[PDB]
Scaffold this active site. Sequence first.
Site, short mmCIF file in Angstrom:
data_model
loop_
_atom_site.label_atom_id
_atom_site.label_comp_id
_atom_site.label_asym_id
_atom_site.label_seq_id
_atom_site.Cartn_x
_atom_site.Cartn_y
_atom_site.Cartn_z
N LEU A 47 3.62 -3.11 3.80
CA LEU A 47 2.25 -2.92 4.24
C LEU A 47 1.30 -2.73 3.06
O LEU A 47 1.71 -2.51 1.92
CB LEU A 47 2.16 -1.72 5.19
CG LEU A 47 2.85 -2.01 6.52
CD1 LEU A 47 2.82 -0.81 7.42
CD2 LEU A 47 2.19 -3.20 7.19
N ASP A 48 0.02 -2.86 3.37
CA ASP A 48 -1.06 -2.68 2.41
C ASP A 48 -1.42 -1.20 2.32
O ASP A 48 -1.06 -0.39 3.18
CB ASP A 48 -2.27 -3.52 2.84
CG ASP A 48 -3.31 -3.69 1.74
OD1 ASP A 48 -3.09 -3.17 0.62
OD2 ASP A 48 -4.35 -4.32 1.99
N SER A 49 -2.14 -0.85 1.25
CA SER A 49 -2.78 0.46 1.18
C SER A 49 -3.84 0.62 2.26
O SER A 49 -4.06 1.74 2.75
CB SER A 49 -3.37 0.67 -0.21
OG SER A 49 -4.36 -0.31 -0.51
#
Lengths: 177, 558, 155, 76, 49, 171, 65, 79, 62, 87, 122, 128
Positions: J41-43
């Site tokens: 996942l992304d930040s």
Amino acid sequence: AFLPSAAYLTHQQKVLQLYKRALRHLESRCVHRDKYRYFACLLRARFDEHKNEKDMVKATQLLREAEKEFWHGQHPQPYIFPESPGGTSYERYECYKVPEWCLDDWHPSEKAMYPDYFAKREQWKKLRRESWEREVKQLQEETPVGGPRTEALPPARKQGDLPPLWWHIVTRPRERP
Amino acid sequence: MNLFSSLTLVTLILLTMPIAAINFNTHKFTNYPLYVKTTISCAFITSMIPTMMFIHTGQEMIISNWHWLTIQTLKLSLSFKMDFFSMMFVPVALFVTWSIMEFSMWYMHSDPNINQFFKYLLLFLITMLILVTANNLFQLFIGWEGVGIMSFLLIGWWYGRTDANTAALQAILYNRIGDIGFILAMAWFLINLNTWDLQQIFMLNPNDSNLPLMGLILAATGKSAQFGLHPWLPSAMEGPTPVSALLHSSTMVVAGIFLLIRFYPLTENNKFGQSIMLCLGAMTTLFTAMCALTQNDIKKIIAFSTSSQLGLMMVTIGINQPHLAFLHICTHAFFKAMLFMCSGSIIHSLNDEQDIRKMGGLFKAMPFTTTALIIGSLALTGMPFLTGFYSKDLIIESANTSYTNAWALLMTLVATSFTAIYSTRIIFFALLGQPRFPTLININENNPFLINSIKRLLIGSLFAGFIISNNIPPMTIPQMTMPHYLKMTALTVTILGFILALEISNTTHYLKFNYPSNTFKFSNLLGYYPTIMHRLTPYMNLTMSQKSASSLLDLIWL
Amino acid sequence: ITKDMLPGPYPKTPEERAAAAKKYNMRVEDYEPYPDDGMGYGDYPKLPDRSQQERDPWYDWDHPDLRLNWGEPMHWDLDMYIRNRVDTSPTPVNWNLMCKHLFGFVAFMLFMFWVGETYPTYQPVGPKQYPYNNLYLERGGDPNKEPEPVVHYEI
Amino acid sequence: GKRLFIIKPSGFYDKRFLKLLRFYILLTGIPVVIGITLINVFIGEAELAEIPEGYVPEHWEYFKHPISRWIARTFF
Amino acid sequence: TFVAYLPDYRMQEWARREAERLVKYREAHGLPLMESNCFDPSKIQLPED
Amino acid sequence: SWDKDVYPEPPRRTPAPSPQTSLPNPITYLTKAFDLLVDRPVTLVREFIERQHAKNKYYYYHREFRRVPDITECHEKDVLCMFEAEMQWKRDYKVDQEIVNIIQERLKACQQREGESHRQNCAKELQQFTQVVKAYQDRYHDLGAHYSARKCLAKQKQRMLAERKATKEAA
Amino acid sequence: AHIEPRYRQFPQLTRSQVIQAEFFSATMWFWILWRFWHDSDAVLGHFPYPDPSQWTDEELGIPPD
Amino acid sequence: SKMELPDYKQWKIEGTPLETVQEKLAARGLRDPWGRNEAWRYMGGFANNVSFVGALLKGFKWGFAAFVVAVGAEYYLES
Amino acid sequence: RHSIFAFTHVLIPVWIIHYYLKYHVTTKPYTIVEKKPRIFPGDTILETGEVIPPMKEFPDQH
Amino acid sequence: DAPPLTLEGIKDRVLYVLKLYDKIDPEKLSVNSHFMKDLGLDSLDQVEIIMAMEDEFGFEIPDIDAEKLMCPQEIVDYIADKKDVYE
Amino acid sequence: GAHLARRYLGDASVEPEPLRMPTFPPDYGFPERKEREMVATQQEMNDAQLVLQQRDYCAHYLIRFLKCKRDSFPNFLACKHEQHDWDYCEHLDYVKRMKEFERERRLLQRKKRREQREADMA
Amino acid sequence: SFPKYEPSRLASLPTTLDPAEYDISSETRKAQAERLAIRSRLKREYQLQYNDPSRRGVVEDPALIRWTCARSANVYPNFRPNTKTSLLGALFGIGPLIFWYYVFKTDRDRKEKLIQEGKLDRTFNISY
Ligand SMILES: CCCCCCCCCCCCCCCCCC(=O)OC[C@H](COP(=O)([O-])OCC(O)COP(=O)([O-])OC[C@@H](COC(=O)CCCCCCCCCCCCCCCCC)OC(=O)CCCCCCCCCCCCCCCCC)OC(=O)CCCCCCCCCCCCCCCCC
Ligand SMILES: CCCCCCCCCCCCCCCCCC(=O)OC[C@H](COP(=O)([O-])OCC[N+](C)(C)C)OC(=O)CCCCCCCCCCCCCCCCC
Ligand SMILES: CCCCCCCCCCCCCCCCCC(=O)OC[C@H](COP(=O)(O)OCCN)OC(=O)CCCCCCCCCCCCCCCCC
Ligand SMILES: *C(=O)CCCCCCCCCCCCC
């Protein structure tokens, strides 16, 4: 800006905090949940349009006018959580959070009302006082010259020792006394 | 005779007996809140008999029972005035307080200082019935400052919280600014009329009474949250819910209105005082109702509701109709205490959630609370033949048909529409629609304390206007002849407010995001009035309290 | 406490400024005093007049209610900028724009009440008519004198 | 089950002060109230009367309540 | 207990009861209740001019 | 009781109970319950206390102050006589204060007892109150906190000079 | 047995609170319709408001000169 | 001590307003990742909430019924 | 001991306050002043026995 | 009112939220699944997950802690710290 | 409410001002106009303790209604017709006030058309 | 474009709209690191005394003691009478005294002139 560990905010942290504050103020603007969820994916698309920007000066400027966008579109009274600072129930029970040392000032007729509790509190305090000089001599050999650089503390290294500066964090009052 | 005065004093002594009980304690209590609630129930029953034998004959009296002081021409005696105002206010106040304490035995059950809370709430009730029964200005000042100090102690109940202490000191500040005018009135009556007693004030009947009535209007501004000295009543929602229900909706905040209703033979012969009351009341009932349109905390919205109703009370005093204003006090107590109780039932059910933007779907989750909130809102707006119809509509039926400031009438009608707007706003964001509260549902209301406490004020909010207005005698002549567009004014304006706010509420489901307008920023930041003056007037005090007062003059030069 | 941690006179030389900034426990670049006009502030640091409401609330404070740390040189008006008092926090609307909207709103409502007092509304009726010489003995008329006849007629 | 200990300061000394306060007030409060009740019931309130011819009253005989007569006779 | 049963502290009660004599003496004899002159105006010699 | 001349009460006129509706009022039943439960035991205890009052009958007296010479016929700076004059004047000052208080009690009781017709039916008490306040003001106003018989005599002499000059300028 | 807290679903309801809420809603509309059926003039109007122009000059005394 | 949570496989956003939201997002190439989290607000016992005119008219049916009963009772009592 | 509340908190204070008002307050002048009762045409006076005559006959309007 | 939170309850609720998330598959999700490295996942997605925790439990996690919560076990441990569970 | 527009937006010369009126004699236009009869005696409404605002030309209905209200305790719904009588006669008093107002407006119209006829003729 | 936020004395500019917050230069790194170092050193010096069991009393804060000594003691010995100090001690020192002096003297001369001309309604004024 003002933080315990870092002396500043990284650009990545600034982007994430502006995204979070934008979504929170947006949810304040956009009360209903499906409507906010639609505009939330729209705003996620607006934030992911320039996610892959390599130039940090251009990203700095884009973040700056994004802050101007967020300030122009902010809600006047955003939703603050009740126990969040600025909330209606915030620091409400702080008048019930008696510090633990006041148990030392009790009379022995009411200390005898809870015998197991104070009989265990004696060895809690015993643990604290035979941990204190070991964790002081732990901190005096690890701290650099000029004092510690950052406010973060090292953990318990040896087995049997306790982490330094631990008593007020462990024995703090409950949030609902 | 011997029944009336005896049970009159028995009511007040009975209210003071649990204060002696809580002060003479050694044990831990066998449910002292139940003891105080039982005592106030029986004090209600006791005060019912003088009210019924007042409705029988009109029997008023004075009990000047204890001589206290004689300053050379001023015999200050302990003197209780049992007139129409006391005989209608004391059973209503005791009934509302009895429902508030049966509410508080549920709501304030987690508080380990519950005995201190019921003690303070009884102290407030004692000081308030000292206020509304006093026959001289000095005993009224005793009750006046008493409800101010118990307001302080019950706003700052969670005394660790900074905002509660801030709001309590704010309320003390605005009330003492009103006390400037109250002491101005006492000073004028002592110098020019040689009395603080009401009877000698009314019998001498002065003509140059502009200055004492300006003092009394400043006192009612400080006390009933009129414009200029208003923001402490929205700030005072930081206290607990039964505090805001009993004190700051229905019982304490009507005391400036009660002070002006009490001095009606001076206001009925001073047109300038009537005009100033009309202008200030119309300004307050416009401004607070406009601020209520764009708020999201439900306690703030119902506090702006009660301050707009106080402004309407000031309006109907200002048209020289004081008895309609006092009927509106006795009416307003029931449904506004019930609206605060139902809002706090929602708050305690939804785990201290007060913001209406995280509510909804409570029509079938909390059915009794939804029923009583709808009944309280409809009594507030002026639904036909609820309790709020039997006074407020008559107010409009005398605000149209009188020699009136025209702009004050138009702002009164705009306020009447805004009442419907924020009432259906509360019902929209809090009861209707789909849920917005978090996922762990702990929604429950099945305590006989909560249900019976809302039930008795529900019986009040249904029947009490009919019962009281058919039990009170005429003191004016009701103006009952007017054209049909003028008779149908308040109902049509209220329904127009409902329609406009339903269109506003159905514009919120649309998938559009508009930038905030200047009217929204004005009404949401409270006319910019608590944002500026709460920063500027302390600043210009405290720097002047440090630079020139302490440092320059009184440490160096002098 | 002893003397060399107490405040002194105005720093003139830069080494006295460095000794004070070490004494007041802050950087020499941030350390500025109040200007030596003779108003008696001394060598106290001119902090930039920020209210304690503005601070980080989630930061681990030594004084959580004050939002203040141990050894931090406090503001001169720290009793004034507590969260029970004077705030300097940013607002959503500009300061002068708030003052303009408030003054225009209050003065315009005052002017509209003056307009409505200039032009009052009423009912298409005559005056209210009372018997017995406009109720002369009821309104406090003396019983020995007799007023003019106030007679009203049917219509 | 799972009863939790509530840390609070010592309420022993405040309650001890209030018990001692009420005791040392009532210690002479209750005899004084009972004695004043017995005086007002049995010794009772004096009656106004015209000064007789040739009878010059004492200075303490110009007062109504018996404790006031005792104070005006004994100390004043 | 001593202060509560002070023997008419600064003769207030007497002064009421004395007033209850004197009003009764001058309601009945038709006199005004209080003269505008504290002393007899016959025994006063004014400066002539 | 008291003296009904200094505290006048006009003859009471109560109307007869005229029950028109068939529903029994609660007030007669509560009055009978108050007469049985409350009036009787209090009355019996009061009769016991009054028997104990009769078992020791003793009297108190109203103190009389014979009139000493006033400040007008006392010599200048002769403290033995003008002390007596000052004590007489102060006793008369406090008695005049209580006369004003009696007239105020009359006016307030008249206003409440007449109710709404207080302006029509209390003209005589208001007239007596205006006369006694004019008299008390002419006699004792504006003396100051260090008032004495000399201040009152000098105010009386200034008022008599003003009245004599007003009499002279009218002729 | 009390109302159990539930998760992401509709909470448990008692028969008694629902029948009391419906009973007081019926009491509200009963009392509204009842006093609207009997009074009908506190909302609409008690007496006719006459037209001033529909009055004749003889009862008001306007001699035409 | 255990609160038995329901299934996460039954919160499907078909037949909801999240269906409309996902359609209008996919109309411009966007996809809604927190919809099934929101799905419990719009289904079950919280689905089909009344309007404001329906919240006002709670009890009006039985109230009008008992109203007609009392009007018939007084009309058959007055004769 | 089922209704000791109405005895300790009501009935004994009604005794005390009735003794106070009957033998100490009303025995003093003008302490309890009462508005005289409202007299209508047609009433019968209990202190006298005098019947108040009715009003004038009405010039009826309806 | 105010029901007690348990690590079983906090664990099951945090995993119940993350199993209603359309970028986390419900078969690879564990109690130690790292958001950036293990779930990919992304930040931005991590900030949305911490905001979903705030929506779930009715309080706020500050940003100095929201920038470091990188597994569901850290979330359960942080709510255990801020709610005092297993008394 | 249209007369407010007639007095403010129009002229106040023809509209009768509320504070001091009638400006015309009561016999002007009325041959042998009779007075307004008071039914309740001054002493009767003195003993009934009526408000000075309530002692108008129809206070006798109010005296009958208040006697009924005293005599029908506790049945507080038993005297609706006496309240109806008092409200109807107060309504008729308000109608008489409206008739006085329309009389004053029509005599000011008479004066206006009189001076306009004089300016047209002479 | 957008309305720029106007800072004030009682409305400070936010941290986000200030440009100098977005400095990336190494001298700002040095200043921020030295502020973090002083703050961390003072935090450590505090909470070694705070968490000490052998201490039972008050951790004395010399910044607080220094603040109170500045607010009380340092007022006179750093005074210099000049134009600014004398004019500001004459404005707020003998200004409003003269103001209320002439206001109250004017009103009392007016009231005395009305009383000696028989004008002031002093009818029921016998308490004073
Ligand atoms: C009680 C003990 C409590 C515990 C002990 C500790 C107390 C505290 C310690 C105090 C120490 C002393 C301090 C100095 C004070 C000294 C006393 C003094 O100066 O007294 C002054 C004053 C003057 O009394 P006095 O000069 O001695 O006598 C006056 C008479 O001229 C001459 O008197 P009299 O002859 O006319 O009267 C004689 C009287 C005796 O005299 C006294 O009682 C006076 C002494 C009492 C003083 C008490 C002061 C202590 C504090 C009291 C208040 C707080 C109490 C606790 C809290 C209570 C709840 C709040 O006789 C009686 O009481 C007997 C009658 C009883 C009637 C009730 C029962 C009747 C029915 C019985 C049925 C059963 C039997 C049937 C069969 C019978 C067969 C034969 O006395 C009082 O004030 C007495 C107290 C009661 C006053 C009235 C109370 C009700 C008023 C209500 C309206 C006003 C308030 C409205 C408030 C509104 C809400 C805010
Ligand atoms: C459980 C408690 C109750 C007591 C139980 C045991 C006793 C049984 C009951 C019988 C009691 C005894 C007989 C009755 C009492 C005596 C009656 C009597 O004549 O007493 C003499 C007098 C009556 O007054 P008075 O008019 O006779 O004399 C006043 C005194 N001079 C003239 C010198 C000024 O005193 C009392 O009655 C005292 C009781 C008063 C009650 C109210 C107290 C309130 C205190 C408030 C303080 C601040 C006031 C501020 C406000 C002022 C106004 C604005
Ligand atoms: C009918 C006639 C009507 C006439 C109207 C015109 C006259 C009245 C004019 C208005 C006067 C009152 C308004 C100005 C003072 C208000 C001060 C106040 O309430 O401060 C509140 C403030 C906290 O408020 P807030 O920001 O809401 O806090 C919550 C979050 N911080 O709290 C603080 O900041 C704490 C400050 C403590 C110290 C206060 C210093 C200022 C004292 C002001 C005294 C004013 C005296 C006025 C006297 C008038 C005499 C005629
Ligand atoms: C003339 O218009 C007489 C009526 C009173 C003054 C005007 C009031 C106008 C507002 C009330 C009616 C509103 C109808 C929607």
